[PDB]
Design a protein around this motif. Sequence first.
Motif, PDB file in Angstrom:
ATOM      1  N   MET E  14      -6.284 -59.324  -1.206  1.00  0.00           N
ATOM      2  CA  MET E  14      -7.194 -58.368  -1.824  1.00  0.00           C
ATOM      3  C   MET E  14      -8.330 -57.994  -0.882  1.00  0.00           C
ATOM      4  O   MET E  14      -8.711 -58.774  -0.005  1.00  0.00           O
ATOM      5  CB  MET E  14      -7.795 -58.964  -3.089  1.00  0.00           C
ATOM      6  CG  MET E  14      -6.910 -58.855  -4.307  1.00  0.00           C
ATOM      7  SD  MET E  14      -7.731 -59.511  -5.760  1.00  0.00           S
ATOM      8  CE  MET E  14      -6.392 -59.425  -6.936  1.00  0.00           C
ATOM      9  N   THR E  15      -8.871 -56.797  -1.085  1.00  0.00           N
ATOM     10  CA  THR E  15     -10.064 -56.356  -0.374  1.00  0.00           C
ATOM     11  C   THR E  15     -11.271 -56.420  -1.301  1.00  0.00           C
ATOM     12  O   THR E  15     -11.140 -56.294  -2.518  1.00  0.00           O
ATOM     13  CB  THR E  15      -9.919 -54.915   0.137  1.00  0.00           C
ATOM     14  OG1 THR E  15      -9.588 -54.050  -0.956  1.00  0.00           O
ATOM     15  CG2 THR E  15      -8.839 -54.829   1.201  1.00  0.00           C
ATOM     16  N   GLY E  16     -12.442 -56.617  -0.707  1.00  0.00           N
ATOM     17  CA  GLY E  16     -13.702 -56.631  -1.440  1.00  0.00           C
ATOM     18  C   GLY E  16     -14.770 -55.921  -0.637  1.00  0.00           C
ATOM     19  O   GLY E  16     -14.454 -55.167   0.287  1.00  0.00           O
ATOM     20  N   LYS E  17     -16.033 -56.157  -0.984  1.00  0.00           N
ATOM     21  CA  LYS E  17     -17.142 -55.551  -0.251  1.00  0.00           C
ATOM     22  C   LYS E  17     -17.425 -56.340   1.024  1.00  0.00           C
ATOM     23  O   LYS E  17     -17.921 -57.467   0.967  1.00  0.00           O
ATOM     24  CB  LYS E  17     -18.402 -55.465  -1.114  1.00  0.00           C
ATOM     25  CG  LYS E  17     -19.548 -54.761  -0.403  1.00  0.00           C
ATOM     26  CD  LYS E  17     -20.583 -54.205  -1.365  1.00  0.00           C
ATOM     27  CE  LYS E  17     -21.556 -53.284  -0.645  1.00  0.00           C
ATOM     28  NZ  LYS E  17     -20.949 -51.965  -0.302  1.00  0.00           N
ATOM     29  N   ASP E  18     -17.097 -55.735   2.166  1.00  0.00           N
ATOM     30  CA  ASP E  18     -17.270 -56.354   3.486  1.00  0.00           C
ATOM     31  C   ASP E  18     -16.546 -57.702   3.601  1.00  0.00           C
ATOM     32  O   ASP E  18     -16.975 -58.587   4.342  1.00  0.00           O
ATOM     33  CB  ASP E  18     -18.762 -56.509   3.818  1.00  0.00           C
ATOM     34  CG  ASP E  18     -19.522 -55.193   3.739  1.00  0.00           C
ATOM     35  OD1 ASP E  18     -18.974 -54.153   4.164  1.00  0.00           O
ATOM     36  OD2 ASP E  18     -20.673 -55.200   3.259  1.00  0.00           O
ATOM     37  N   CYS E  19     -15.439 -57.840   2.873  1.00  0.00           N
ATOM     38  CA  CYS E  19     -14.667 -59.079   2.857  1.00  0.00           C
ATOM     39  C   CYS E  19     -13.221 -58.824   2.455  1.00  0.00           C
ATOM     40  O   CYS E  19     -12.896 -57.769   1.909  1.00  0.00           O
ATOM     41  CB  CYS E  19     -15.284 -60.085   1.883  1.00  0.00           C
ATOM     42  SG  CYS E  19     -15.133 -59.631   0.139  1.00  0.00           S
ATOM     43  N   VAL E  20     -12.364 -59.802   2.736  1.00  0.00           N
ATOM     44  CA  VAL E  20     -10.978 -59.800   2.270  1.00  0.00           C
ATOM     45  C   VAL E  20     -10.598 -61.194   1.817  1.00  0.00           C
ATOM     46  O   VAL E  20     -11.221 -62.181   2.214  1.00  0.00           O
ATOM     47  CB  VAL E  20      -9.963 -59.363   3.349  1.00  0.00           C
ATOM     48  CG1 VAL E  20      -9.952 -57.858   3.498  1.00  0.00           C
ATOM     49  CG2 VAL E  20     -10.244 -60.037   4.683  1.00  0.00           C
ATOM     50  N   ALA E  21      -9.562 -61.264   0.992  1.00  0.00           N
ATOM     51  CA  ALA E  21      -9.063 -62.534   0.509  1.00  0.00           C
ATOM     52  C   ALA E  21      -7.554 -62.529   0.548  1.00  0.00           C
ATOM     53  O   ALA E  21      -6.927 -61.517   0.236  1.00  0.00           O
ATOM     54  CB  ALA E  21      -9.550 -62.789  -0.905  1.00  0.00           C
ATOM     55  N   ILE E  22      -6.982 -63.660   0.945  1.00  0.00           N
ATOM     56  CA  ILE E  22      -5.540 -63.842   0.940  1.00  0.00           C
ATOM     57  C   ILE E  22      -5.222 -65.224   0.376  1.00  0.00           C
ATOM     58  O   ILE E  22      -5.893 -66.204   0.702  1.00  0.00           O
ATOM     59  CB  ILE E  22      -4.928 -63.653   2.348  1.00  0.00           C
ATOM     60  CG1 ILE E  22      -3.400 -63.757   2.279  1.00  0.00           C
ATOM     61  CG2 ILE E  22      -5.496 -64.657   3.342  1.00  0.00           C
ATOM     62  CD1 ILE E  22      -2.695 -63.191   3.490  1.00  0.00           C
TER      63      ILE E  22
END
Lengths: 195, 195, 222, 226, 204, 233, 196, 196, 211
Positions: E14-22
């Motif tokens: 997933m993408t977020g605000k100035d970040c990503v998660a896997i």
Amino acid sequence: MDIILGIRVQDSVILASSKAVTRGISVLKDSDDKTRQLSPHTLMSFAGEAGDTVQFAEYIQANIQLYSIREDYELSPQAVSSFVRQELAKSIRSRRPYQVNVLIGGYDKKKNKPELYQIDYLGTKVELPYGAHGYSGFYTFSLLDHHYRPDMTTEEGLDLLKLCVQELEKRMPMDFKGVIVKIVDKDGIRQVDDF
Amino acid sequence: MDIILGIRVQDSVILASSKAVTRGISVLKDSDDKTRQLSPHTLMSFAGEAGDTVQFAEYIQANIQLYSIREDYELSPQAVSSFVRQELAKSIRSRRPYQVNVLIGGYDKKKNKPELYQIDYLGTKVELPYGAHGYSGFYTFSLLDHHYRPDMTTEEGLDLLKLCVQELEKRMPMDFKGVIVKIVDKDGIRQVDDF
Amino acid sequence: QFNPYGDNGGTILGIAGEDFAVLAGDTRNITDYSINSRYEPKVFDCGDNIVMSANGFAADGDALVKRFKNSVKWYHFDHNDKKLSINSAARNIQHLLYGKRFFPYYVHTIIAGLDEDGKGAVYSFDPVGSYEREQCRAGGAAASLIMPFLDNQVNFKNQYEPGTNGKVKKPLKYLSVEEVIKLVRDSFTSATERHIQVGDGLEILIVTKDGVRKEFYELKRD
Amino acid sequence: TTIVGVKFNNGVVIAADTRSTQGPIVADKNCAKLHRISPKIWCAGAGTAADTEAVTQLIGSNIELHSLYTSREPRVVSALQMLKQHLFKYQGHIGAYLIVAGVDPTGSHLFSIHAHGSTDVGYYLSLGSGSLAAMAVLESHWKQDLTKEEAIKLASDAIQAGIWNDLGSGSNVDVCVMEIGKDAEYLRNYLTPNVREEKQKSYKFPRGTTAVLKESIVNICDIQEE
Amino acid sequence: SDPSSINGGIVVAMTGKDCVAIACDLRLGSQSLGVSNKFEKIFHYGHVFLGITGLATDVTTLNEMFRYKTNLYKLKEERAIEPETFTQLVSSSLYERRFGPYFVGPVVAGINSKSGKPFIAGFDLIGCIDEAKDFIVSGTASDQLFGMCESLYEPNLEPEDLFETISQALLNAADRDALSGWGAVVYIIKKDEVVKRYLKMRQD
Amino acid sequence: TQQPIVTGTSVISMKYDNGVIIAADNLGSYGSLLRFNGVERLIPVGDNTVVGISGDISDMQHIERLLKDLVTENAYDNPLADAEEALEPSYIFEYLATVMYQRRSKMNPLWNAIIVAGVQSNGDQFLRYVNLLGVTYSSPTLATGFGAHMANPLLRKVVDRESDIPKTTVQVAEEAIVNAMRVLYYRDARSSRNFSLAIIDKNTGLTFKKNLQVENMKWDFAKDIKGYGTQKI
Amino acid sequence: TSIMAVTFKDGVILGADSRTTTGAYIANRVTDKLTRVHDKIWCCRSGSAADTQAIADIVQYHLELYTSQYGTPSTETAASVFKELCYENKDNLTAGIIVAGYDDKNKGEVYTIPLGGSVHKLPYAIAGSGSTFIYGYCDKNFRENMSKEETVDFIKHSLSQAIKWDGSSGGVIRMVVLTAAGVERLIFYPDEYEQL
Amino acid sequence: TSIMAVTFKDGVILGADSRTTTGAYIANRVTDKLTRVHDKIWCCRSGSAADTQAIADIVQYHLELYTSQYGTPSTETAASVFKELCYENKDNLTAGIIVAGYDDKNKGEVYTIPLGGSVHKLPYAIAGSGSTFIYGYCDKNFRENMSKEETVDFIKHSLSQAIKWDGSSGGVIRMVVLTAAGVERLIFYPDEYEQL
Amino acid sequence: TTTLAFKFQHGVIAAVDSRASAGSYISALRVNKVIEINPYLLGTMSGCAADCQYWETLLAKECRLYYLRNGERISVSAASKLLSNMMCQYRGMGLSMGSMICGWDKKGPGLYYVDEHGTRLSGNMFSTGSGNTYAYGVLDSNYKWDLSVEDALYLGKRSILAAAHRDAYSGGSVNLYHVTEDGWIYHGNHDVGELFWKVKEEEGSFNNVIG
Ligand SMILES: *[C@@]([C])([C][O])[C@](*)(=O)[C]([C]C1=[C][C]=[C][C]=[C]1)[N]C(=O)[C]([C]C1=[C][N]C2=C1[C]=[C][C]=[C]2)[N]C(=O)[C]([C])[N]C(=O)C1=C([C])C2=C([C]1)[C]=[C][C]=[C]2
Ligand SMILES: [Mg+2]
Ligand SMILES: [Mg+2]
Ligand SMILES: [Mg+2]
Ligand SMILES: [Mg+2]
């Protein structure tokens, strides 16, 4: 099921039948008795497809028990074996045949003789001094051909049978969990509780 | 072949492997050793299609023995397991793949730790405290999940292994003719001659 | 060779409240990559405050509903206009389905209503008649998309209370009809986005002691 | 997939939808199906998506080198010939079905190409699962001597037909116009008629809702000095 | 029989605000049999993260391959590979096996070190790129993950909020899949710090 | 279980403000052979219903006879056979839908796709589909076979939802149907130029048009098309 | 498909329909099946469009290279190149090609090359799925040394019937006239030929 | 097989070839495929000889019994009986029958009943494996209200071409003329029709 | 499925899991795989859900009629036979049903295994389903006739847990029953997620799993 053996000695018939029952990859039971008493002096062991074996055996048992009550008389082993053969020969051309192989061990009280009949699921009957079904004969018949005499005692018959089971336990890939042994003679049917 | 087990205890790795070899309906041998020493502190057991198992094992053995001579140094169990995995992963996309599953039990002399690696014929590697191939795990993993601790002694590891073999001998339809047990520790590889 | 079965797509959703129940379903009907209808009702009021939907192969679904509606009619005739309870309907439907065990009605069936204590009830079936009472159930094409969302947002699965860090679960507080309808509409909007057989329209049937009410909502038509 | 190609007065236009599917599931809602072979030669692909991309990049790479070798601007017939000979060699195993369009010193061109290596010529074409819905629009409304504005309308209307009536097609409309004597204009998301409505609820969770066992910092930096 | 479902497993990004998660589950099985609960499916090459689902032998083989290729890239280029570039490398490497493919479902996640832009991408087993803004899913519970992500996701989530969203998407999807679960890991990625969290979940 | 032998292609239809329109070509194909050129596939039942049938023609002729027999049977002991107790479109459809689903359930289907178009007693438009599987559905526009893929998209541009029906006149609806038939002739390899069209209106009743032809066709642009790529001459 | 090539007094004419199908869908209704391999050597294509295009492209290449070295090739030579490709790759091809050309020495010639890769020189030839329906018509109506107008009528009437009965055939009727005068393309639309 | 039935001014004529094959062997070269079910209602048979004979025998029985009760049956009635048998037993039959008959009220009529069991009333009909080759010829050459001699020539020329191209067809051309005058059988040998 | 049942000193324990599958998809998380035929008769379910429910619900109809005709509860032996006879009628027709008929009658506690082949086996311990091998491992090494009601219930519970963990098609929750001569006694629904962590800590088992 797997292995059923039979041997006719001087004065009795001995039937040995494996104890294992398997479903899928699991052995559900290691004490199963693959046999039914058809009459006081007639014992039938069986082996084949799951379910069909017991259903067929019990159906035969009921019919012979019905005959015994109606006539107040025990049918000869020969008569019973012929009845069983006809039922299997009738069955093989049915919509769904009963996939059952049997050995019939009986003591004929009239002739004072033990008798062993081998009948496969097609209705193929043979009277023999010793018999087996499936792959059992492949391992055991060479021993029986060598050691068997017609004047053997019951105790000698059991010893020759122990040798047959030992050979099976050595050279068969399947674990059949030992055998239940039963003796059929003039006094009736009894089980050998230590084998 | 049939059953291969592995367990990593405190200070050693124990591998148990069946003794049976079957051709057709006949058990040709009941004392077969399904293992090869790859290096003084690395043992590999194997199971799969006939012929391929020994050919693959010996081919791996030769390659590790060649490495040992060239560098005058024993490869870590991790390095050997990675080499073996690559060979199997290379093999699975070949014209005729080698149908072999292995367990690699080794004692890392640098880290002073026992290590057990499970690798199947596809090249699927996992480091485990205890492992098996084929149907062996279906019967044994529940016992291992229950009884296993990482601080177990070698003697406790053998007792838990005896329980696993007893369960297999009870609930498996096939007779695998017992197991040869070998222990891999800091002093090298030795066979338990009474099991 | 003749294939007696087909797939008309669609998706259905049943949720049981404390004193109400909802049964929802999209109104799209399809074969392969074509649209047959953008509005083809799939959830039906079967009488006695029971709603029903058989989703999958529409021909088999319509036959089942038709037969169950008929079973309700004859229940009244044979048992002095007695009301068919939701548990009694469920068992009746089991026998309708298993009667064709060897040539199945290829549908996933769901019924909803109120039990004899007035509480909300949903029952879920397989194609050969196996059934159970459930709190929450999505059926059909996008069933696998929707059910986990409901495990999370209806039964509060994998949700814990902040600060305790996994020691204490989120308590299972009941949901209002307004709250349920939100979860239904968001479930179908989400399914419409990611499933090609879901879209066009959404029809919801709400069951209370006062009767059966209907609500319709548009969905994306692509 | 729905893709179309329409010729007009002074050039050619292609368009496509923006849905990519895995089975009945929508993998990407805004996929870009309009690929560039050369600056003024664009293609759009249906079928095996990886094959349409790989074959487009390969031919585009060789077309670029060819253009540098000959000191000439690339021609659409070159892309066409190179594509069909590649596809034919693989006997349909490369599942690429394309509509190729562009402008070059010879003029404006519009071709279709199928996976086995057959090519066709036309003034209006359609490919993909939505081809029949799009072709129904094209056969109803296409005429000779279309203007640029009329062709874009016809092309996007044909794509919309596929979006609405074909389940394999959906979301938005992409367009690329290639006019003679001009730069090609790529109009990404030319139409956006399928915006998802606002959700009834927010599913933002309370911080701490998820149970955790272990936390650790991951070293992404290289080995450090000192 | 189906190579893509023998071992099981899932990955989501997933993408977020100035970040990503896997994130990924930890299961490795042989069909019905669970073999390992420590089979991590996410790897990283510098600051670029790669998750791989599918046949486990190919998962391991591809990780070793991309480690090989990114290490050579770095030596020659004198810099770490970026997510956009790596995505194309993955796509190239998979398509070179077009008629004998790796049975995998890779997912790329990372932040461009120069532009600071969050980036995720997905592929099929043959190389086709899916560059989504919102989320990417892969594995035996891909249908379940699509349903969870589509409903739970909202743009511009902060790192600690994004963590909850991706974790809940993974967990609940895995709990409706027989071949996924047995533990889970979530990576939260910012431009110059990466946090890795192991989730508590049901072990059946 | 059988296979269809002699077949009829698309049947197309739509609703408009005061009624329904239905159309189907006059071809009976024998595989790729265009064997029979005078086949009527729209079959009127009374003055309020037209049944359009595609698929196997032998089964169509069987269904034609069932409907003829249905009219006969309805008249028996029925003084209101031409009034209140006349056959409705809904009665005719449900009968056929029952037959179709029964036959598929015996694994011996009538290999057809059928559209029943008509107007009810209360003036309501009736338009519903049924096929060899017993699958039924209704829509403002309905079409079978190729018509589903090519006609429906065009007809749905006129009537996209229920609320567009009152806004659509008979002239606009007929125009859309006729254009759709032309498109099908361009693109369906088992279609013919000759077709029949039926209008059932709540005011003007049943109008049945025979021997219609596809006209205003565009072929001139073909002269300019040369080769399959590089060929100029 | 319905294709034919007919020799007449002044040379030869090739004729074809314009329909291409993918099952029952008409993928292209204005196809050009009359393809040039040399100035005055053309061919009619039937079978796999991919196979026939690939072959004709290769033949055009061979004859272009032949011309550069040895001058204008004969129609027989062209047919041989087609044959050599069709025969040697018969396992992987599905191509039924008619070759037609005009020399000044040999005048109009027609060669047909069916599926197996055999060659047959003929006064006229017919091929394609629609040809089956006009074997009787064409046999009864063909004459040697017809005029240009008579030959155009023969092809028009013939393909008209092929189109009428074969669903795989249709669209416009294209023709190519090959004589000493040059190369003339013709086209005939439905409204003209259907009413014959 | 090549069979056809043609209506003309005075009535109807049925025509057929005489060849029956078992693969490529000609089991009978003088077969009579024109079979009578009633005085002036005849049929042409194609498909399985066993099936078509069994059907025609059953039809002859039904029409004999019809006649005993209700008088002379129409040609339409005969076709319906054929249809009913062919349609209801379509799964187990392979029969393609052309029915032709003469009434005084209805005059000459022709009905064709292809594989599925559908019925089609026509001015003329063609069927059998050899019919494919004469669709074009027959369409171009048929006229309504021809004379007896014109109709005999039409059938002769048509079947001649069918025989010429179809290996499954051949032998003699048999014909049966059905008019108010009565029933006339005709035969035409190879040496006559081959040279047409 | 994973189900088990065993005889012991104080009656019979019956334990089942609660999962249902449709391929890799987990269709149901809490299905009831035990049927309460009567106050002294239980039936476990494994195989086709539909089948299991229909035929064991029908068995209960037939066991109720036995009571009405004879004024006496049916034996476990007779009840198991009626069921095995139902299976023999649909012999080869494709049913899938594995079940244990547990109860208490005049001969004491009874336990019979019955499957779709018409097999009918008497015994002290049985386990059916995709995860039966895992359950048998724990049962075989820990079973005794001299178990206490508390220890027996735990064994059945722990055995299902073992299967739920390893078998992908077993899990959800554990349903426990204890059959006495006064009838069966339900001992609750136990979520495996919570039970696993609880058992891990208290028992020290599952050392390899991290928690
Ligand atoms: C194990 C999980 C392994 O399957 C166990 O056997 C269960 C048994 C069970 C018994 C009673 C009630 C529920 C489950 N079996 C199943 O879950 C079977 C497995 C199966 C699938 N195909 C198949 C199976 C078994 C044998 C032959 C063929 N699953 C099913 O039968 C499926 C069809 N059931 C459902 O999908 C159900 C749904 C949905 C549902 C059910 C069952 C019950 C109540 C509500 C909803
Ligand atoms: Mg014998
Ligand atoms: Mg769409
Ligand atoms: Mg599990
Ligand atoms: Mg001949």
